[PDB]
């Protein structure tokens, strides 16, 4: 009742100031930092008046109308943006949905360089408000879908890193690992979220709600159906708001939801003790990541209530959505060893059968062996898991990746080179994540990390589409993306693309570059190699590839006029078109 004020009171200025900063950051990505700070201030001063008098001019207005009006005021730079200006004509809810459509999932922003360590540690004490506020903005404008309250938590942890490491006996030794653990954590944290958002925005909330249901029931298998639905609802709400740009209420509701949980901990899950003792940001991050609680021991079989019962069709027709939710919750709670997508497949599979039976000839008879149809759908993933993982240990993550650059480039050569590189690199990072574990823990680990990663290629791509086959797989089902993609075979259509001269020669700036980032150019070359000769190709590449790896190492220790990079670059560009 005057909202800007309400949300300011619940959260306090720092967050309030930080939250808006992310918003603007996230929409106006090609906007330089001061401009945002200014807008934020105007927004923050204005908010405070509404704290004082609820009734004063525009305090009642919607947060999005408030954001929006402000966003309309100097998007008048479209000279550097373009056609987000269109949207200023339309009005709520139209405009915000029009805006969100222009979120750049891959902006042309200079790779954010980090300076020497003294320098960062100096700039901390000079102005630390600015230092962290810039931390937000640079991260935020690059990851425009980020789960906002989490950004905060990182920010907290980033400050924790500097607050200590600038007085560490050896600054850089404290600092770097911590920051790399942050650079690492965030990237994962951000993609997780991107999935969530896209499902809400392409597939809808009924689709998300199942997601939620399945994965919560796995988390708190002790808890009752009535409890979980409650959580799912509220969880859905939150994420709807953070995807829909509604950042302030997103945050507020998230921390309302942390609180309801920590109170109702014997009605939920045993293992919440440890999260719920911690501060308000730690809390939510923690419960976000709680390990799967002890499942109740000796539970009935489902068939009883979902197969043999002779009210099945009547209760299905009566409340299909609740009946299916209750089903899913049941099968979910008993299978933390299945992936969410699989449990999800099976609950869609049970739906489609019940739809087939309830009006046709003999319901008990046709649906009676529903559980039999699951068996195939269960085994298919586990097979593909084993296969990859042995491959992972045989090769070592680096080699494994390369191999996938092969699988995929050949499978879909039309797609951009840096896209394949990243996407495959991360697809490799699954093995480092999941093969670690035993085969209880593996399937949900890998298949749910994969969903995340294939969605990355999906949205990275939908930007400027080049392959229809990608475009198709992203489109049809969410659950069945991994299957769909798994299916593709080497692209016969594809005419092989010419010959870059300079793409296959490298300068001596390469030696200044790190391990990862040396390998990263190598992986780029590998993508371009197959974009070129898909034809006569097997491990004859591994030959030409080790050649690049080697000659790189030799040339960096040659004390030359950067000679053999350029000069013998001509040797290998001619000798490779042979080999």
Binding residues for Zn(2+): 64, 244, 246
Q: How far is CA 10 from CA 53, 133, 460, in A?
A: 16, 21, 36
Residues annotated as binding site? 3, 10, 64, 237, 241, 244, 246, 249, 252, 256
Closest CA to 216 of 122, 354, 340: 340
Cα–Cα dist 360/378, whole Å: 27
Locate 83 and state its tokens. Answer: 């056609």
Angle (CA) 424 113 150, round 5°: 70
Binding residues for Ca(2+): 3, 10, 241, 246, 249, 252, 256
Sequence-distant (6+) residues with CB within 8 A of 316 are 323, 354, 358
- Other beta carbons within 10 angstroms of residue 471's beta carbon come to 13
d(CA 69, CA 281): 31
Which residue ranges are tagged as binding site for (4Z,15Z)-bilirubin IXalpha? Answer: 237
Angle CA(402)–CA(403)–CA(406) in degrees, nearest 5? 90
Task: Give the DSSP H/E element, type plus range, for residue 454.
Answer: helix 442-462
Rounded Cα gap, residues 571 and 579, in angstroms? 12
126 token code pair: 């000079």
User: Rounded to the nearest 5°, which phi and psi values hold at 299?
Assistant: -95, 150
Evaluate whether 254 touches 238 at the Cβ level (below 8 Å): yes
In terms of Cα–Cα distance, which of 451, 457, 449, 462 is closest to 407?
457
- Strands (DSSP E) contained in 321-388 are none
H-state helical runs in 199-319: 205-219, 225-243, 247-263, 280-288, 303, 312-318
Distance CA 56, CA 61 (A): 11
Angstrom distance (rounded) from CA 72 to CA 257: 33
Q: State the DSSP code for 133.
A: H
In this structure, are residues 64 and 136 in contact, taking their beta carbons and an 8 Å threshold?
no
Residue 112 gets the label, from left (phi > 0), alpha (psi -120 to 50) or beta, of beta
Kindly give the residue spans of alpha helices, DSSP state H, lying in 498-539. Answer: 515-532
């Amino acid at each position: 009742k005057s909202e800007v004020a309400h949300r300011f009171k619940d959260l306090g200025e720092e967050n309030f100031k930080a939250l808006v900063l992310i918003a603007f950051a996230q929409y106006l990505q090609q906007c330089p930092f001061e401009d945002h700070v200014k807008l934020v201030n105007e927004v923050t001063e204005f908010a405070k008046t509404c704290v004082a008098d609820e009734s004063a001019e525009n305090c009642d207005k919607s947060l999005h109308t408030l954001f929006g009006d402000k966003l309309c005021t100097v998007a008048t730079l479209r000279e550097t943006y373009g056609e987000m200006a269109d949207c200023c004509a339309k009005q709520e809810p139209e405009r915000n949905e029009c805006f969100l459509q222009h979120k750049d999932d891959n902006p042309n922003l200079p790779r954010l360089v980090r300076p020497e360590v003294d320098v960062m540690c100096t700039a901390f004490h000079d102005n630390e408000e600015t230092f962290l506020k810039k931390y937000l903005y640079e991260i935020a404008r690059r990851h425009p879908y980020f789960y906002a309250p989490e950004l905060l938590f990182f920010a907290k942890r980033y400050k924790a890193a500097f607050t200590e490491c600038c007085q560490a006996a050896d600054k850089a030794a404290c600092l770097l690992p911590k920051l790399d653990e942050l650079r690492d954590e965030g990237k994962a944290s951000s993609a997780k979220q991107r999935l969530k958002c896209a499902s809400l925005q392409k597939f809808g909330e009924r689709a998300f709600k199942a997601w939620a249901v399945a994965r919560l029931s796995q988390r708190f298998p002790k808890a009752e159906f009535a409890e979980v639905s409650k959580l799912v609802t509220d969880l859905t709400k939150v994420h709807t708001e953070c995807c829909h740009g509604d950042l302030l209420e997103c945050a507020d509701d998230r921390a309302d939801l942390a609180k309801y949980i920590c109170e109702n901990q014997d009605s939920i899950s045993s293992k919440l003790k440890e999260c719920c003792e911690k501060p308000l940001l730690e809390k939510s991050h923690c419960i976000a990541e709680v390990e799967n609680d002890e499942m109740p021991a000796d539970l009935p079989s489902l068939a009883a209530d979902f197969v043999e019962s002779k009210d099945v069709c009547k209760n299905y027709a009566e409340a299909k959505d609740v009946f299916l939710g209750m089903f899913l919750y049941e099968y979910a709670r008993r299978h933390p060893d299945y992936s969410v997508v699989l449990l999800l497949r099976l609950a869609k599979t049970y739906e489609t059968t019940l739809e087939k039976c309830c009006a046709a000839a003999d319901p008990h008879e046709c649906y009676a062996k529903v559980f039999d149809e699951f068996k195939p759908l269960v085994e298919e993933p586990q097979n593909l898991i084993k296969q990859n993982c042995e491959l992972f240990e045989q090769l070592g993550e680096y080699k494994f990746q390369n191999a996938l650059l092969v699988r995929y480039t050949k499978k879909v050569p039309q797609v951009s080179t840096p896209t394949l590189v990243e996407v495959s690199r991360n697809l490799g990072k699954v093995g480092s994540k999941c093969c670690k574990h035993p085969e209880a823990k593996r399937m949900p680990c890998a298949e749910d990390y994969l969903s995340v990663v294939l969605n990355q290629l999906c949205v990275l791509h939908e930007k400027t589409p080049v392959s229809d086959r990608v475009t198709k797989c992203c489109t049809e089902s969410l659950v069945n993306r991994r299957p769909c993609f798994s299916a593709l075979e080497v692209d016969e259509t594809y005419v092989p693309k010419e010959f870059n001269a300079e793409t296959f020669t490298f300068h001596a700036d390469i030696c200044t570059l790190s391990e990862k980032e040396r390998q990263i150019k190598k992986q780029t070359a590998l993508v371009e190699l197959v974009k070129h000769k898909p034809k006569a190709t097997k491990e004859q590449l591994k030959a030409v590839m080790d050649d690049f790896a080697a000659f790189v190492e030799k040339c960096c220790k040659a004390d030359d006029k950067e000679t053999c990079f350029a000069e013998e670059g001509k040797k290998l560009v001619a000798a490779s078109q042979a080999a």
